Design a protein around this ligand. Sequence first.
Ligand SMILES: *[C@@H]1O[C@H](CO)[C@@H](O)[C@H](O)[C@H]1NC(C)=O
Ligand SMILES: *[C@@H]1O[C@H](CO)[C@@H](O)[C@H](O)[C@H]1NC(C)=O
Lengths: 576, 570
Amino acid sequence: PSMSITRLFPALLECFGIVLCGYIAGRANVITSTQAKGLGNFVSRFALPALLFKNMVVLNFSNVDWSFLYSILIAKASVFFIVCVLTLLVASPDSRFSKAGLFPIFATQSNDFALGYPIVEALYQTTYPEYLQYIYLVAPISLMMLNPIGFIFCEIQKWKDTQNASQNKIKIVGLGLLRVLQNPIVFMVFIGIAFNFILDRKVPVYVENFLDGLGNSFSGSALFYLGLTMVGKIKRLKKSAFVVLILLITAKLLVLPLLCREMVELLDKGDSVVNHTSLSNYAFLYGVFPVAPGVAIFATQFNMEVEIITSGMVISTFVSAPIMYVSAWLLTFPTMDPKPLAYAIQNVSFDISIVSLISLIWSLAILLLSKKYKQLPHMLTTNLLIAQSIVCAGMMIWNFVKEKNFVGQILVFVLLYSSLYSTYLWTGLLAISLFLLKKRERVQIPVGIIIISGWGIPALLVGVLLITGKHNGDSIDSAFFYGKEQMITTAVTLFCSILIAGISLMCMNQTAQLTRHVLLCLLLIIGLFANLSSCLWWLFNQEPGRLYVELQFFCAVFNFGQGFISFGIFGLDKHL
Amino acid sequence: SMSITRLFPALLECFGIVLCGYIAGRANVITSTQAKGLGNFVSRFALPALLFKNMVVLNFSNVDWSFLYSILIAKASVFFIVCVLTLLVASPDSRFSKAGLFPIFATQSNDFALGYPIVEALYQTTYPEYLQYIYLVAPISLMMLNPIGFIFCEIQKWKDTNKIKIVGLGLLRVLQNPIVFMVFIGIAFNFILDRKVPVYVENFLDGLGNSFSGSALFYLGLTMVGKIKRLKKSAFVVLILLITAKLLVLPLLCREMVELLDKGDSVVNHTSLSNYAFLYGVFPVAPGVAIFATQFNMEVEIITSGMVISTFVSAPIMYVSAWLLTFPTMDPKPLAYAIQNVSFDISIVSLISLIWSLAILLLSKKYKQLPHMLTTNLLIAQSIVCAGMMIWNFVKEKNFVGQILVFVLLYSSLYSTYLWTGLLAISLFLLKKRERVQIPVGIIIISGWGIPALLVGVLLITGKHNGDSIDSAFFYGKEQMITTAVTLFCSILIAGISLMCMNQTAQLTRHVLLCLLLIIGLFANLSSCLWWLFNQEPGRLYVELQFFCAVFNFGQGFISFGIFGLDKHL
Ligand SMILES: *[C@@H]1O[C@H](CO)[C@@H](O)[C@H](O)[C@H]1NC(C)=O
Ligand SMILES: *[C@@H]1O[C@H](CO)[C@@H](O)[C@H](O)[C@H]1NC(C)=O
């Protein structure tokens, strides 16, 4: 298989549950900012050097495939190079140097030791154990060979601020180099490299247990400190700052991994195909890691665009968790055997539905306890989140009732597709209600009649698909329970909702609470747009290709992880 | 059967992280307000996650319950005796606060932070079922003994200002402890999921539970900065009694009651269980007791000082006690390797701490004072003894001359440290009564460098070296032990005269105790020399006494560093 992809989701659950625990402790009032500063002082001055010293003392230089290492470093250097060049061209002259010195560090440095190491440990203990050392090999060399260029740029900008006009470029570039060398990772890696040759690859027995005890405490405490640093750093941004954060985070999380994969297939001349494919998949997985908090530390000590870099980190850190999941499950998809892709789709939808259901339970509890349900339009939003909770509960039933009885399977399918179709048309009803409220017309909206329609029409569609459709016993996936009749019924329900939302969207342009309501209608249309395309692909192409598999996987993710997006938009808000 | 070889790396982890936390605390790296956040993480997030994971996984079917209520009766018995005399002997205005805080302090060990790594090192590859007993005894001991103490402290709170009102307050504070209610949920979830955590939850509990085993000791080291304070005579005396109770008579009660209540029927397992039961009581006082005294705001100084003292004092007690249990085993010939290994491992920690204390005294320019000058002379000699053991472990099968050279330096250093403690005490007694400069101390230092050299010279001049000796008692045969006895008797008489001159005449606050703590050491050193001459066939009692002679000879620098080094700087 060359990838133990079943046990990736527990690693992302650990790595983001400890981050969530740190965030909860930060926002509550359990640990204030100063005490989180003390925990970070402990982590950054004791835990990371012991971990690095142990993993470089035990590091084996005989089995290291250097080709992957300098291919990944060439990729990171290329990403840094393009981002610095366009940062010099497109930024304003008054602050081109500050952006050119801090943005490529943000878009080139990864959170390897805190987040990357447990995930790679979960994915690469069982079959390919030699890939664990590449984190500790690549991250400090990348730091040492790419960070000084950024600190050089930030120090020219600091020279700009001093406006001395005396040159002596040595005084500045050596200042940047010594600021780089004061990082604990670089000189601690130097000490570990020296002691690897001094001790002859063997940790002393008197110090081994002490270093293991101090190093094993880095992961959880580091994720907890990341969660404690992350309270309240997002704030409200300004025009064009949204676009430059999108461009930087797309660069870091998208074009660096593709460059890593392309340079790995370009620079590796190995004679083994399975080793080459696993190296390419690991190269894709390495670049999707989020930005380390060291960039925000550097901007804080510099007092230099601290808000932009911190906002960039909290968005890339939140955003990479599904990007990691989707990318790794897309990478493990090809070859295999035709039949276990259905089990893979069911397992991925189950792991997504767990997190969406938990976040949806939290957001529903917040919306109910805040007593904001009585005012329009948030009542229909509460109904929508309730319907998505029934979809997720339908997956909880469907994972365990796949092969029990035909009658129970039919009832579970009817309930699950009723909830799915109700969510589908509730998006259109919310959009129509938003369009009616945007008109500022004194029209009494029949919310009770709308709820009766929304609870009856999907049930009628499920009953019609049961009565007229033919059940397919050889289909283990939920999408082919009734065959082509069910997909035709899902297309008609989705097309009517898209037409209703399309009329409301066209009314919004002519007419131009409501600040967020529109985007939840907007973001669902992209979800409904991806559902339509996989149904259109099946009639015109008789042969199910790999693109059909990729489109069905994205249909599953954008259909059943919508509660996560809804929680991210509404639930993480103050006052309520 | 005990893996006693791998105890000393565990004692380096458990006290090196505490030392790392203390240095960062005293320096100014983490101040007091910031240390609270690290404690908040450990006490609210790492410890509850740790407790929940290891009890859902452990099997209740194979737990030897006989050991469980035997260990608990011993802790209950210690609590009972300490509570009884605290009501009789204390002042009437504070009988209830002392009777409620002193016996809780003498019963809760540091099992989750300090006890768990030591038991893990000793009991993984040979007896792996003994590791689950840490997580069983410490919370059960908490629920059935802490409320009994807590009733008395709430009466004292009542005194300044209905039995439900008092006993329910003590009872409801215990279930608010994270240890107590997390153990309740883990026992329930052991039966719900049938000894299996879900795969989606396995990694989350492991990541949060492995971060306790390092961070809690760091916070324990960080909490003790500046907490020792100063105490009066009556508080020093009750503190000695309390630390003696927790670290001495509680472990001996555990061993005796476990051998009485398990009723054998285990062959090799009962003997191994008895040694482990004695080891459980040696663990120091948990830092939760100092936390407990803070929320009560009663007897805060004594309990905090007792906790910061018990963690330090228990560090050699763990090593000596565990190595004494493995002695009645193997054969007499690899017993010599066991004696050599313990002395080498003690001398490592003593030498590193001695280098620090010597550096502090030299750099701070307090050595220019005449009373502190003799301590510096004493402390340099203690550093060279420890370095001599590093040579002797590696020079045993080499040429006779190299063996002789290692032996001459080590025993020269041993007699000089022995007599240098007494001349300084005599010089301090002479300086306290006479204003004359210590001009004979220079002649004494020449003597102290010459008299050991003369003893060293007699062994070089007279050919009586016995090669069949392994460690040290037969280096020159009976001639070396006779020479060591004459040197030891002259040093004890000089120190005895200085102690007697202090009573007849009636900085100096700590100087005396460093002289005092050595006096308990030279009398135990003298008895082992007397034991060898008055006995032809070496018995088993001679083996235990010879080991104790080795520890106070080669780790004597550790006691000196703890008294003098951690005072101040300039
Ligand atoms: C990768 O290494 C070599 C390729 O030269 C070959 O044995 C095989 O393709 C792989 N081996 C292992 C052990 O993964
Ligand atoms: C411990 O268990 C039983 C106790 O009766 C016995 O086999 C022996 O003493 C020990 N056995 C093992 C395998 O440790």
